[PDB]
């Protein structure tokens, strides 16, 4: 309880030399990009003065068409993490940066005496052309130096399948805008992948269902575990993850592949799925695609290129370009070829660009014991990772908002990573650390970036070319050239072995925490996982029929014993799952993540075996626990007959006969309160629930925009998560093969808002614009608004929820004292809320007002695209559409007169401003029985 008669003397400081570009109070968006796996996502990040506070999508970029992922959006709390490495560290104790360049250059003259032998580098799968040119300068200065590229969710099997079918390595850019059916095969392509935002928009562009739409996408999936593409899949099949090599061998023989050598037969529901998915592939040959993700072996990846070359997709929707990444034939096998080189000496310098392989290595690859045999182990990462303690040297990371850099996206388009801010802690990025190893330690990150692009610009007037590349983000004088391929024959001749009986393990990246590189990010942790709405826990995902054979409920801790290792995993049962196919997720069990990701789940990387790195069948469950915490944030995953109010679901077979078949043509409701007249800037929202894949990028972008506090695991289990927007799975149907439906439930901004009439101090009123104003400074904390809110989209600050993964919220010793580096990530237009006030989705009223007030100074009206909320500017599928309702030529006034426009809880006369477009899941005639 802070208390004073006056607020203290607030100092206002100007600059000392104010730069020309900065106007105090204006957002000043900068066009950068983020190296996610090795590829760029393409960003438009908002730097108010120097500090970037909100990552948005670069609409010029090919990967993100103006909308980012869940992980890509929450790179701001990773930037302003107080657990970031604030100083370099030599053998445990802190040090300077120039002590490193006196120790590294003293070890670089000892390597030139040899042929640069012990100079192994362990970067992760980089595509950026400046670090490729610095590597190719490093590997021509030191001849016998090796560059190994380890990535745990790398495209190892995806490139080994491109070698096994085409000869050389080829990059495969799929194109779903000309695609009628998308027969995936263990391919979560709408996930946080290097192309996950474009493959989600192109998949959702095909199924924008309007007044005159008769043909949409189909999306046969056959997924191991329920993955977020399965929300958009209309024929998702729970396959055991070991039969997907045999579903493709049953589908490559229905289409024309001569040497498929099919084996290991199918079940009666996997065979009638594959005789109908391939029947819809033999038709519409020009617009169809067979997808396969890196969970699969390299043979089926080669068969996925065999089917796509049989159906004539090459040149139409599956283009083949030169490989954008530098070393495509190096993955887990490149990490295993390094530790067998790291053993018994014969390595002297080991640079480790941000990989964290002490934590990420498979159990068959002894990277822990092979490390500390290197006399000089250097590590470059923005966290003191699991490796940085076990490394001799350690450098800061220079997170991409702090560092001058490049990155190449898929399609080959290079985008320059400008620093929006100077390095808070002197970061010294990967382009600046190789400058020390090459011999140019005083050369900055900008001096070696323009030194490369001056030589890769064959046009004159480089300053026009360079300033345009920083402005637009993209370059597009550098796209990957389309490669003519062969599709060699005789690659799947060897018959597969017997399908081994036994309970299967399935390795996955968590959609929140991909490979544990961002496990210290608080926004990604408390963001609910897509199907199983959990926050701070790795789980073992079982089917309802698998757990019934083993006899374990939704909270027991089991000791998953793989080939030699046990992991002591909790259990979350899951209806969409495959039989005997227990799924564990990466990204957890970090022992040196920081204060957010330390000991949150079980480390699934201790079960990888580097020969079965994604799935294996030798698992023993052996329950050893009971009643784990498992802080979930949904309460009931089962639509309880509340259809017509949550997710109205239909098929396209019944929509082509009746347009408004999910609407209820009912009489106008009677209200005794009358109504009000909204005549200027009527704000409404249309959420297309048919295209929402539950990517949770809108949950974490409301968090980054509206200063929403993270809440720890102990207070999520009490149902006190602060999330203004939530996605609701609902699991309609059979408990073994259900349909999972998303309802993006935010504050519906009800016109006859029942949450407002129950506010004693009137801390919740309306605009004349029409949206619901939750004023935080007036809230005395009587949680009656939350009780009368029928959707329960009100979210109360219970404790002082502020910097909660860095100080536990059950104290008042640091209640009114805040972390100084976390204050820069906050939006300066949203109230950072106190201990006892309630929150609510305010339609991003700080984005409404900042363009309503700006349109009043220049005497005009707001257009449609001038106001774009944070959940709308992030949705890769563009499910959310915000806009004026009194503007007749608007985009939301079209989407709210569609025959699928329904409002949630119209049984109550709340009259919401948020209407939902209903879900239509395009069932085949040969499979709907």
């Amino acid at each position: 309880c802070q208390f004073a008669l006056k607020q203290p003397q607030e100092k206002i400081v100007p600059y000392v030399r104010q730069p020309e570009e900065i106007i105090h109070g204006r957002p000043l968006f900068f066009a950068t990009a983020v190296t996610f796996a090795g590829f760029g996502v393409g960003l438009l990040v908002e730097s108010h003065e120097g500090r970037p506070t909100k990552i948005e999508g670069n609409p010029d970029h090919p990967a993100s068409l103006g909308s980012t992922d869940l992980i890509t959006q929450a790179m701001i709390l990773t930037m302003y993490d107080p657990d970031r490495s604030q100083a370099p560290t030599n053998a445990g104790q802190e040090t300077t940066w120039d002590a490193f360049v006196a120790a590294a250059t003293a070890a670089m003259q000892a390597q030139t005496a040899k042929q640069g032998a012990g100079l192994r580098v362990l970067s992760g799968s980089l595509t950026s052309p400046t670090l490729i040119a610095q590597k190719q300068q490093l590997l021509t200065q030191f001849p016998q130096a090796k560059w190994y590229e380890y990535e745990p969710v790398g495209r190892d099997n995806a490139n080994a399948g491109a070698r096994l079918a085409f000869g050389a390595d080829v990059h495969t850019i799929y194109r779903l805008d000309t695609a009628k059916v998308i027969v995936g095969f263990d391919a979560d392509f709408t996930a946080p992948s290097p192309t996950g935002v474009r493959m989600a928009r192109q998949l959702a562009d095909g199924r924008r269902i309007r007044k005159g739409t008769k043909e949409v996408n189909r999306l046969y999936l056959a997924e191991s575990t329920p993955s977020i593409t399965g929300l958009l899949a209309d024929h998702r099949l729970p396959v055991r993850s070991s039969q997907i090599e045999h579903l493709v061998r049953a589908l490559a023989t229905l289409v024309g592949v001569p040497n498929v050598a099919a084996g290991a037969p199918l079940s009666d529901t996997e065979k009638k799925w594959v005789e109908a998915a391939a029947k819809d592939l033999q038709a519409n040959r020009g617009a169809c695609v067979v997808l396969v993700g890196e969970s699969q072996p390299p043979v089926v990846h080669a068969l996925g290129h065999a089917i796509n070359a049989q159906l004539g997709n090459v040149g139409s929707t599956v283009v083949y370009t030169e490989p954008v990444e530098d070393d495509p034939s190096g993955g887990i096998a490149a990490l295993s070829a390094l530790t067998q080189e790291m053993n018994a000496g014969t390595v002297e310098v080991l640079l480790m660009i941000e990989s964290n392989p002490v934590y990420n290595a498979p159990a068959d690859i002894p990277f822990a014991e092979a490390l500390a045999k290197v006399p000089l182990s250097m590590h470059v990462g923005l966290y003191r990772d699991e490796t940085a303690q076990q490394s001799v040297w350690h450098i800061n990371g220079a997170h991409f908002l702090e560092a001058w850099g490049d990155v190449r996206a898929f399609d080959g388009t290079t985008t320059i990573v400008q620093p929006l801010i100077a390095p808070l802690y002197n970061g010294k990025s990967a382009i600046e650390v190789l400058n020390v190893l090459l011999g140019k330690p005083q050369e900055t990150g900008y001096q070696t970036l323009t030194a490369y692009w001056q030589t890769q610009d064959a046009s004159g007037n480089f300053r026009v070319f360079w300033n345009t590349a920083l402005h637009d983000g993209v370059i597009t004088a550098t796209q990957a050239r389309s490669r003519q391929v062969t599709l060699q024959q005789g690659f799947a001749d060897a018959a597969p072995p017997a399908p081994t009986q036994g309970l299967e393990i399935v390795f996955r990246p968590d959609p929140s925490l991909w490979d544990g590189a961002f496990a210290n990010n608080a926004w990604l942790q408390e963001t609910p996982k897509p199907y199983t709405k959990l926050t701070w826990d790795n789980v073992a995902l079982m089917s309802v029929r698998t757990a019934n054979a083993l006899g374990l409920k939704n909270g027991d801790v089991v000791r998953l014993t793989y080939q030699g290792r046990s992991v002591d995993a909790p259990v979350w049962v899951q209806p969409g799952h495959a039989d005997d196919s227990v799924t564990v997720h990466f990204g957890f069990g970090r022992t040196a993540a920081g204060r957010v990701g330390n000991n949150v789940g079980f480390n699934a990387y201790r079960l990888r075996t580097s020969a079965t790195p994604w799935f294996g069948v030798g698992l023993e469950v052996a329950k050893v626990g009971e009643n784990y915490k498992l802080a979930s944030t949904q309460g009931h995953f089962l639509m309880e007959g509340r259809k017509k109010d949550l997710v109205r679901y239909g098929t396209l077979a019944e929509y082509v006969e009746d347009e408004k078949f999910l609407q209820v043509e009912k009489e106008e409701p009677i209200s005794l309160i009358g109504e009000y007249e909204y005549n200027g800037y009527k704000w409404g929202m249309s959420i297309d629930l048919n295209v929402c894949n539950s990517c949770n990028a809108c949950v974490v972008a409301c968090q980054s925009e509206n200063n929403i506090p993270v809440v720890g695991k102990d207070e999520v289990w009490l149902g006190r998560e602060m999330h203004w927007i939530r996605i609701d799975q609902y699991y309609v149907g059979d408990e073994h093969t259900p349909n999972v439906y998303n309802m993006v439930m935010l504050c519906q901004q009800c016109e006859h808002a029942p949450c407002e009439i129950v506010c004693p101090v009137a801390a919740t009123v309306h605009d004349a614009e029409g949206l619901n104003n939750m004023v935080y400074n007036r809230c005395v904390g009587t949680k009656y608004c939350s009780n009368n809110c029928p959707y329960k989209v009100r979210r109360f600050n219970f404790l002082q929820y502020q910097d909660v993964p860095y100080r536990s919220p059950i104290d008042a010793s640091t209640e009114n004292d805040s972390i100084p580096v976390l204050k820069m990530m906050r939006n300066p237009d949203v109230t950072v809320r106190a201990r006892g006030v309630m929150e609510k989705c305010t339609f991003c009223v700080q984005r409404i007002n900042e363009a309503r007030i700006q349109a009043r100074t220049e005497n005009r009206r707001i257009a449609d695209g001038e106001i774009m909320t944070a959940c709308q500017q992030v949705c890769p599928t563009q499910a959310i559409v915000f806009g004026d309702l009194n503007d007749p030529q608007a985009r939301v006034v079209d989407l709210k007169e569609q025959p699928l426009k329904y409002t949630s809880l119209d049984k109550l006369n709340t009259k919401p401003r948020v209407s939902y477009l209903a879900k239509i899941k395009n069932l085949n005639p040969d499979l709907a029985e």
Binding site: F637, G719, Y730, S904
Partner: protein
Amino acid sequence: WFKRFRVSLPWLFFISICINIGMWFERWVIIVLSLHRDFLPSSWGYYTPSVW
């Protein structure tokens, strides 16, 4: 209804002590059981009270 359990104070005390515990439970059923499960299934809570 019966005077047997009204004039007898060891019986009127047990009846009245079952109303103070019971009418607490009426106001628990009214408040919690209407709040902890409501319109939307994705907002179903439990409210096990803490020591405070």
